Amino acid sequence: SHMFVSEQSLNGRWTLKFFPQPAVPVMTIEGAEAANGIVVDAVVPGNVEIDMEAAGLVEDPMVGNNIYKLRPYEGYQWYYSRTFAAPVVTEGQRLVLHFGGIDTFAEVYVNGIKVGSADNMLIEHDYDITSVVKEGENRLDVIIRSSVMEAQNHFLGTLSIGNFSNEESAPVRRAPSTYGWDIMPRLVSAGLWRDVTLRVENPVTIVDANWVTLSVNPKAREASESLYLQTRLPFEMHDKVKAVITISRDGRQILRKEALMRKFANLFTLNLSGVDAWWPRGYGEPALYTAEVSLVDVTSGKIYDTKTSKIGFRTVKLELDEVNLPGQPGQFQFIINGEPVFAKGTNWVPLDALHSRDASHVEEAVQLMVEMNCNIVRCWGGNVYEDTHFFELCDKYGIMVWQDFAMGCGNYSQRDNFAAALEKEAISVVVKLRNHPSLILWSGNNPNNDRVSRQVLSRVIYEFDPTRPYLPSSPGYYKDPFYTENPSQFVSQIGYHGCPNRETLERMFSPDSVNPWQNGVVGMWNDEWQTKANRIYDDKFQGGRNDLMTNQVRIIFGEVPADLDDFIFASQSVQAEAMKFFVELWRGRRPYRTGIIWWNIRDGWPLLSDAISDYWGGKKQAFYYMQNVHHDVCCLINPAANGYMLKVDNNTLKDFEGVVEVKDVASGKQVFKGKFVSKANQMSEIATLPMQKGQGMLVISYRIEGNEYFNHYLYGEPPYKLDQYRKWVKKCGIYEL
Amino acid sequence: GNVYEDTHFFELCDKYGIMVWQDFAMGCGNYSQRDNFAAALEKEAISVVVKLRNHPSLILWSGNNFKAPNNDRVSRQVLSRVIYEFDPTRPYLPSSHLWGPRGYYKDPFYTENPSQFVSQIGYHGCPNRETLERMFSPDSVNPWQNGVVGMWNDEWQTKANRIYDDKFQGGRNDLMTNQVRIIFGEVPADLDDFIFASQSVQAEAMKFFVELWRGRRPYRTGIIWWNIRDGWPLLSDAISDYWGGKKQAFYYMQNVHHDVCCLINPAANGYMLKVDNNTLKDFEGVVEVKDVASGKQVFKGKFVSKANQMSEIATLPMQKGQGMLVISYRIEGNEYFNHYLYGEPPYKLDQYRKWVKKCGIYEL
């Protein structure tokens, strides 16, 4: 809520002219209009393929093999054009042209005068157009060039060549997923994908307002907040402007402080009483307090600028482990407000390959994590750094955020030119997001000689966000020791494939390709089912990634069904049982295990993937299984050496009592019943269950404070009869077909 | 915080044999880590290092000074490299609350500090009357506004050095009255008695710090105390003001800074007479110590102060009440003087005035 004296939006209908890029790229307005190109109507914020799908220049990429048709456009230039009315500016004011997003390489012009050259699509771009704008109608021109051809202006190293990350993504500062991954299609795209506005700043204006929680005492309701305020203050306005700080919540004012501005930068130490701490889900309430800082004349009372934002009193600390694997990644635990929390959350992959539509999906996608009851989310470093509204929702619902810098799986350059570009990107995203109480950790992914992970990105966090930790390293049968014997305490659980819901299959595949098996032979996939498993490039082959779907249903259910509806139930149940087993395994192995970040809650494209929900909101069967093992207090069953083990886990700060009843669903015979006392923030073992005979399923019905919850545990050894598992599920009554 | 002094300053330090510890120009505060700031400091460091790397007095270069250090680029990288290439003869020190509770100078903070070399210790002292009348306007020469003792007028607040004219009462000036309150009980209303009060508390404190350090070598390796001279007419914790008004502590410190000096340090169940030798030559002499209140001699004997070490003479019996012990020692046909204030605070101010008169070492 940065109250600039004027903020006039420039979003709307623009004029897009695209043409193939020649040998030397076009960078001038003269060459842009002189090029033999194609002109259509565009929309900002938007992507070029959205504007081209309108007016019928290309078919829907979301459907069948229609994606690869966008290939020739990757070598096209894009010429956005517009005309705007300049606002009146008094002497001393500044007119700033704001760009929330520009994918990617581009030259910005105002009235035929270049105001800027771009080279990053993840950071915002602002330009001062005071001395170039005229009165009345002004023209705004943006000449975007081909991102793929920019990669050939650099010499890559041996390490940068041959990774899961496209070699074209290394020399350029763009989201690595765009160039094509295994969970997102290849769609480099282009265009102004975020807002474009005009801003009028006064000579006295707030450059930055950095809120920092130094200490917090949840009991007695106390906290110590700091305000690192940097302003632009003309010297004749020194000792004449006062800063007004206001902390309030639900209308009621908690704190108000006034101070005379005697310098451009100041630090205001605030010791508040009667304030609540910000907690993640389960460990308390996401208490937020509206923080406002204004610069106002001491004589006339005119408000030159005001910057408002909601903050949360919370301290984060990462406790390392130098006893079990000293130095190996995964031996840490998050401590929020002095309490060690258990993290149960998702990895955040792109919401759309056309990221201009991301903002419309954040509201519903965050709601998926609310019903899922995730207290943490890891924004993968292949997506684009999300905008304030994403973090605002995480602040609102108490979902901690683990942000990875947009770096690919492979190794990057160690020369000065790349490090300079990455430092600019890091400072921009850090200063933008360092005030959200949800954000708890920065990561550079990725020996330990990487300038990027162990120097460039660390130096930035050192000087601009010393309140959050920085980690310079990050990552058949689902009961195989490869999973059940993982050394990491904080784990990033690899996902299992799962066929999307039938309604999705009929919408993404052509009517003749909805059936997965080409020529009717089971085990073989048609070309469309091969592309929707993400085949970045159009190379015709058989099997590959899709074979994981049939391998899982073959290990668990013996044979893969020939019916599509039965194959859906098979692939979704093997995923539901696998991911439920992974969460129950880590929640039951506390206090050694510290957290689990599963992959993934939602996809960013109509594709066949390891997610538990597709791009169109189709919740797979695994989504509902996971919900019963993500409660604040949950009773589960783990495998033991000489039997089973009924446990309860508590992810809150309050104790709970209750009663649990475990019975065999098939027989109806009661295996165990009794009262349990689940102490807070720990795992408590109830009793050892005797080894049941044969195959079957045990239903768990436990009541806590007058509320009946349910869970189950499938015992025995695979393979199982598919129709008998369906029988067991319907008998439990917890989930539905 | 000061500029790099010119070549002439180091020429005098070469002439009079005063070693120089040069802090690089940076003050209480971490600095930038980006490339632009580092490029400017490499240029500044190379310039100042090449200019001063030929003066024998200069011995050491320094870089100066919640959520968890040694990661600073400038201190541990930019400057280090300049010293590595342009001056490998002098050692570089990465960085340098050493005053702590600025109350009683015998607090266990000062008394039991594990430091071998202290570089920051200082106490406040009201400047001489002649400078007070010169820096203050006639209506503000008296410090107590509206006649209320303990409350400073606006000009006295401005002269403790308010960087900005914020009308606030107290702050740094309260250190003057808090020290007089602990040592002498009450703050004198008369201006001449208050000047004698603050300068005496400063003199006894600073003398006690140099004594407690020279009296505990060789674990103690040095003592750099706070400013000797102010750079502007101001109420400060220095021992001489900008116009040359040498305060009381200047003369007290002068007697405990001799090449060979006899002093008394507090001990368990009594005191201890010691001698310190900061030369490479041995010395022999005789010391006579007697109470100034009664005149009763407490010790008299001959000592041998071996070179470059501290030697204990004998243990002194613990006196019962309050008073002062004058120290008179003779070395190679020269009489030197010192003293020691025993007892427990607070002390009667006019009584400490009497004891100083009896010693016959300092005036006022």
DSSP H or E run through B208: helix B191-214
Q: How far apart are CA A203 and CA A23, in angstroms?
A: 45
Alpha carbon of A226: minimum distance to chain B alpha carbons (Å): 12
Q: Does B76 touch chain A (CB under 8 A)?
A: no
Q: Does B67 touch chain A (CB under 8 A)?
A: yes
Contacts of A53 (CB under 8 A, 6+ apart): A59, A60, A61
Q: Does A454 touch chain B (CB under 8 A)?
A: no
Q: How far apart are CA B278 and CA B283, in angstroms?
A: 11
Q: Report which DSSP code applies to B75.
A: I
Would you tell me which residues 82-111 of chain B have a C-beta closer than 8 angstroms to some C-beta of chain A?
none
User: In this structure, are strands A196-201 and A205-217 parallel, antiparallel, or unpaired?
Assistant: unpaired
Are B121 and B98 in contact by the 8 Å Cβ rule? The answer is yes
DSSP H or E run through B250: helix B248-255
Are A64 and A368 in contact by the 8 Å Cβ rule? The answer is no
Q: Report which DSSP code applies to A702.
A: E
- With beta carbons under 8 A apart, name residues in chain B contacting A459: 33, 73
- Tokens coding A686: 């109830």
User: In this structure, are strands A2-3 and A303-311 parallel, antiparallel, or unpaired?
Assistant: antiparallel
Alpha carbon of A466: minimum distance to chain B alpha carbons (Å): 7
- Are A463 and B164 inside 8 Å of each other by CB? no
Q: Does A214 touch chain B (CB under 8 A)?
A: yes
- Are A262 and B34 inside 8 Å of each other by CB? no
Nearest-CA neighbor of A430 among A455, A397, A466? A466
Task: Report chain A's terminal Cα–Cα distance, integer Å.
Answer: 47
Burial degree of A645 (CB within 10 A; 0-12, 13-18, 19+): middle
SS (H, E, C) A15-29: EEEEEECCCCCCCCH
E strand map for chain B: 20-23, 58-62, 92-93, 117-118, 222-223, 260-267, 270-277, 283-291, 297-305, 309-316, 323-331, 335-342
Measured between CA atoms, the residue of chain A closest to residue B66 is A214
- Are B34 and A466 inside 8 Å of each other by CB? no
User: In this structure, are strands B283-291 and A332-336 parallel, antiparallel, or unpaired?
Assistant: unpaired
- Tokens coding A1: 């809520």
Contacts of A417 (CB under 8 A, 6+ apart): none
Q: Beta-carbon neighbour count of residue B349 at 10 Å?
A: 19
- Determine the residue type at A31: G
- Are A466 and B71 inside 8 Å of each other by CB? no
- Are A462 and B166 inside 8 Å of each other by CB? no
Q: Is the dihedral of CA B255, B259, B264, B266 positive or negative?
A: positive
Nearest-CA neighbor of B353 among B343, B337, B341? B341
Residue count of chain B, please give it.
364
Contacts of A670 (CB under 8 A, 6+ apart): A661, A662, A663
- With beta carbons under 8 A apart, name residues in chain A contacting B73: 459
Q: How far apart are CA A525 and CA A519, in angstroms?
A: 9
- With beta carbons under 8 A apart, name residues in chain A contacting B32: 463
Query: How many pairs of residues across A and B have Cβ atoms under 8 Å apart?
Result: 15
- CA dihedral of A408, A412, A416, A420, whole degrees rounded to 10: 0
CB-nearest to B71 from A260, A420, A462 is A462
Q: 3-class SS at A202?
A: coil
- Are A423 and B34 inside 8 Å of each other by CB? yes
Q: How far apart are CA A121 and CA A103, in angstroms?
A: 5
- With beta carbons under 8 A apart, name residues in chain A contacting B68: 466
Q: Does B77 touch chain A (CB under 8 A)?
A: no
Are A715 and A695 in contact by the 8 Å Cβ rule? The answer is yes
- Tokens coding A41: 């109507």
Mutate to test the interface with A, among B66, B70, B166 (most CBs of A within 10 A): B66
- Are A260 and B34 inside 8 Å of each other by CB? no
Alpha carbon of B30: minimum distance to chain A alpha carbons (Å): 9
User: In this structure, are strands B309-316 and A2-3 parallel, antiparallel, or unpaired?
Assistant: unpaired
CB-nearest to A214 from B35, B66, B71 is B66
CB-nearest to B67 from A420, A459, A467 is A467
Q: Report which DSSP code applies to A692.
A: -
- Determine the residue type at A161: I
Alpha carbon of B32: minimum distance to chain A alpha carbons (Å): 7
- Are A462 and B164 inside 8 Å of each other by CB? no
User: In this structure, are strands A303-311 and A289-297 parallel, antiparallel, or unpaired?
Assistant: antiparallel
Q: How far apart are CA A686 and CA A672, in angstroms?
A: 10
Q: List, in sequence order, the alpha helices (H) in A201-302.
A: none
Alpha carbon of A437: minimum distance to chain B alpha carbons (Å): 16
- Diameter of chain A measured on Cα atoms: 87
Q: How far apart are CA A662 and CA A689, in angstroms?
A: 9
DSSP A266-333: EEEEEEEES-PBB--TTSS-B--EEEEEEEEETTT--EEEEEEEEE-B--EEEEE-SSSSTT-TT-EE
- Tokens coding A318: 């990462």
- Tokens coding B46: 């190379």
Burial degree of A257 (CB within 10 A; 0-12, 13-18, 19+): middle
SS (H, E, C) B180-201: HHHHHCCCCCCHHHHHHHHHHH
Paired strand residues for A117: A107
Q: Does B33 touch chain A (CB under 8 A)?
A: yes
- With beta carbons under 8 A apart, name residues in chain B contacting A458: 71
Measured at the CA of B199, the angle between CA B193 and CA B202, to 5 degrees, comes to 140
Q: Beta-carbon neighbour count of residue B364 at 10 Å?
A: 14
Q: List, in sequence order, the alpha helices (H) in A518-597.
A: 527-531, 547-557, 564-588
Q: Beta-carbon neighbour count of residue B313 at 10 Å?
A: 20
Q: How far apart are CA A197 and CA A230, in angstroms?
A: 23
Measured between CA atoms, the residue of chain B closest to residue A424 is B34
Q: 3-class SS at B39?
A: helix
Phi, psi of B81 (to 5 degrees): -70, -40
- Are B33 and A462 inside 8 Å of each other by CB? yes
Side by side, the strands of the sheet bearing A316-320 are A316-320, A332-336, A339-340
Give the technique used to solve this structure. X-ray
Q: 3-class SS at B129?
A: helix
C-alpha R_g of chain B: 23
Q: How far apart are CA B72 and CA B43, in angstroms?
A: 18
What resolution, expressed in A, was reported for this entry?
Answer: 3.0
Paired strand residues for B92: B61
Are A146 and A74 in contact by the 8 Å Cβ rule? The answer is yes
Q: How far apart are CA B325 and CA A401, in angstroms?
A: 69
- Are A262 and B73 inside 8 Å of each other by CB? no
DSSP H or E run through A94: strand A94-99
Paired strand residues for B265: B272
- Tokens coding A632: 């604040």
Q: Is the dihedral of CA B165, B169, B174, B180 positive or negative?
A: positive
- With beta carbons under 8 A apart, name residues in chain A contacting B166: 260
Q: Beta-carbon neighbour count of residue B233 at 10 Å?
A: 17
Measured at the CA of B52, the angle between CA B48 and CA B53, to 5 degrees, comes to 110
Paired strand residues for A144: A78, A106
What percentage of chain A's residues is helix, strand, coil (to nearest 5)? 25, 35, 45
Q: How far apart are CA A400 and CA A315, in angstroms?
A: 12
Alpha carbon of A167: minimum distance to chain B alpha carbons (Å): 29
CB-nearest to A466 from B67, B73, B164 is B67
Q: 3-class SS at A65?
A: helix
Alpha carbon of B168: minimum distance to chain A alpha carbons (Å): 13
Nearest-CA neighbor of B308 among B265, B331, B276? B276
Measured between CA atoms, the residue of chain B closest to residue A316 is B67
- Are A462 and B66 inside 8 Å of each other by CB? no
- Are B33 and A463 inside 8 Å of each other by CB? yes
